[PDB]
Amino acid sequence: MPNYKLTYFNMRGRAEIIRYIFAYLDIQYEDHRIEQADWPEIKSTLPFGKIPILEVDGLTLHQSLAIARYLTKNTDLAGNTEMEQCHVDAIVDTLDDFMSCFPWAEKKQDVKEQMFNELLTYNAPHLMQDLDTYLGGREWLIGNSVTWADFYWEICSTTLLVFKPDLLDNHPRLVTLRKKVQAIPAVANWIKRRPQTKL
Amino acid sequence: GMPNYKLTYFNMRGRAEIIRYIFAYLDIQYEDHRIEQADWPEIKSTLPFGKIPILEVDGLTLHQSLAIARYLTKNTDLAGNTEMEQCHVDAIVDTLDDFMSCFPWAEKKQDVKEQMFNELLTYNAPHLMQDLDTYLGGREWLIGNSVTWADFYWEICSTTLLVFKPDLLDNHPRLVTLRKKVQAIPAVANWIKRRPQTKL
Numbered sequence: 001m002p003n004y005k006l007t008y009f010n011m012r013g014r015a016e017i018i019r020y021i022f023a024y025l026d027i028q029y030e031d032h033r034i035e036q037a038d039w040p041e042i043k044s045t046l047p048f049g050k051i052p053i054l055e056v057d058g059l060t061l062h063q064s065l066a067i068a069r070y071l072t073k074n075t076d077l078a079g080n081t082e083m084e085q086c087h088v089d090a091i092v093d094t095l096d097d098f099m100s101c102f103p104w105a106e107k108k109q110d111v112k113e114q115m116f117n118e119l120l121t122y123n124a125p126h127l128m129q130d131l132d133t134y135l136g137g138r139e140w141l142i143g144n145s146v147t148w149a150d151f152y153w154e155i156c157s158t159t160l161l162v163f164k165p166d167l168l169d170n171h172p173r174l175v176t177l178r179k180k181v182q183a184i185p186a187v188a189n190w191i192k193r194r195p196q197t198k199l
Numbered sequence: 200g201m202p203n204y205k206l207t208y209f210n211m212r213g214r215a216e217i218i219r220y221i222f223a224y225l226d227i228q229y230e231d232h233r234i235e236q237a238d239w240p241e242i243k244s245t246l247p248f249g250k251i252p253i254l255e256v257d258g259l260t261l262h263q264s265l266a267i268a269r270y271l272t273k274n275t276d277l278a279g280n281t282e283m284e285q286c287h288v289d290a291i292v293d294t295l296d297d298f299m300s301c302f303p304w305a306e307k308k309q310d311v312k313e314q315m316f317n318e319l320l321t322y323n324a325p326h327l328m329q330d331l332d333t334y335l336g337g338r339e340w341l342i343g344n345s346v347t348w349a350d351f352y353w354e355i356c357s358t359t360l361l362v363f364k365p366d367l368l369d370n371h372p373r374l375v376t377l378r379k380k381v382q383a384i385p386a387v388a389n390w391i392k393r394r395p396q397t398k399l
């Protein structure tokens with residue numbers, strides 16, 4: 001049985017998808033959260049110098065979504081058919097591409113607010129509208145059961161709602177989908193028990 | 200029977216090229232549909248997420264270049280050998296795609312675009328090259344013991360970067376050897392010869 005150690009900041013951020021997957025599959029792991037001060041010494045040891053990382057039986061994996069896909073392989077979270085797995089991958093990359101546009105590391109707090117604002121004002125509504133149309137009246141984003149794409153939607157939309165509360169005022173179906181993710185017992189339990197962080 | 204494949208993108212290597220190498224390598228027939236920057240605005244409003252490339256499979260539309268590449272390579276010799284090696288393949292690909300994605304391809308302000316391209320290539324790119332160099336070490340391929348689509352993606356992304364920064368790999372002969380090996384694979388070599396010659 002694999003020993004798992006997840007390393008990231010004390011933050012939902014890019015690690016959260018992995019956290020939801022372990023919760024859902026009832027897989028025990030070490031949720032190793034590092035204070036900023038412990039980062040330079042860890043970073044120096046990593047091939048690509050980024051987190052999150054996941055150690056599996058003492059072997060290091062990197063890239064949040066690569067890890068997420070590895071953990072869901074051969075499970076019901078992956079997608080039920082090969083083409084469905086493709087749609088799961090595609091939705092995840094669409095969300096990630098958008099989340100990746102935000103200047104998270106930008107030090108000038110004034111340059112940062114100008115950019116976050118432009119993305120949320122002009123770009124975000126187009127995405128939400130595309131996601132809404134894409135979902136239509138279906139139960140989940142892909143197929144007839146929950147996938148890690150639904151989890152990723154709930155996670156990304158939570159972050160976006162921190163900056164733009166009215167993001168989904170015109171998309172009750174997308175709100176419902178968040179609530180469906182949030183009501184899954186293993187996910188709800190995680191949401192109840194996790195550390196409260198802005199991001 | 201055999202699925203009908205139609206790829207849509209600009210007349211450009213860009214984000215479609217990984218798909219093109221994969222079809223070439225797997226010897227799969229497809230319609231390589233290339234659109235003009237003038238016909239773009241129209242087609243855009245018809246795509247579920249308004250981005251290219253898209254791949255139509257028997258009339259069903261797929262999107263996201265790397266989602267498509269993973270779909271085409273699943274259960275093939277281009278996927279990683281083990282489930283764990285498949286993770287390494289995906290992680291290298293995302294590392295490369297993350298960096299290429301930092302470039303402001305769509306920036307409407309030329310001066311801003313130029314400034315960020317220069318900064319990415321002067322500061323960020325050399326660090327990524329050293330990381331990749333150390334990662335590859337003296338191994339033949341990036342992951343496992345045979346070529347994967349990660350090696351393909353390296354060659355494609357580095358091709359792009361070399362357009363803007365010709366000296367990028369002067370200090371990395373092992374990364375050059377890998378590109379040369381990808382470029383020498385007969386099906387890839389054949390594609391590189393016959394593809395439309397574009398800047399990017």
Ligand SMILES: CCC(=O)N1CCc2c(cnn2-c2cccc(F)c2)C1
Pocket residue numbers: 011012013014096098099100101104105159199
């Ligand atoms: C340390 C920088 C920081 O404050 N954050 C890191 C990035 C991030 C945060 C929240 N979501 N998120 C994220 C999730 C997925 C994809 C992505 F690009 C970004 C908060």
Ligand SMILES: CCC(=O)N1CCc2c(cnn2-c2cccc(F)c2)C1
Pocket residue numbers: 211212213214296299300301304305359399
């Ligand atoms: C229309 C914008 C443009 O000039 N290009 C599109 C983006 C691009 C080009 C070349 N490589 N590339 C690319 C490849 C992979 C990942 C990625 F983010 C970007 C050229």
Ligand SMILES: N[C@@H](CCC(=O)N[C@@H](CS)C(=O)NCC(=O)O)C(=O)O
Pocket residue numbers: 013014043049050051052062063064065293297
């Ligand atoms: N696409 C990657 C991005 C990883 C990334 O950029 N992570 C940040 C933390 S959110 C990091 O480690 N940055 C470098 C640093 O802070 O030293 C992933 O999803 O894992």
Ligand SMILES: N[C@@H](CCC(=O)N[C@@H](CS)C(=O)NCC(=O)O)C(=O)O
Pocket residue numbers: 093097213214243249250251252262263264265305
């Ligand atoms: N990560 C996506 C990016 C897709 C993307 O942004 N493609 C560009 C062209 S290279 C596009 O469609 N631009 C949107 C537009 O110009 O309207 C992928 O790899 O497919």
Ligand SMILES: [Mg+2]
Pocket residue numbers: 093096097293296297
């Ligand atoms: Mg990506």
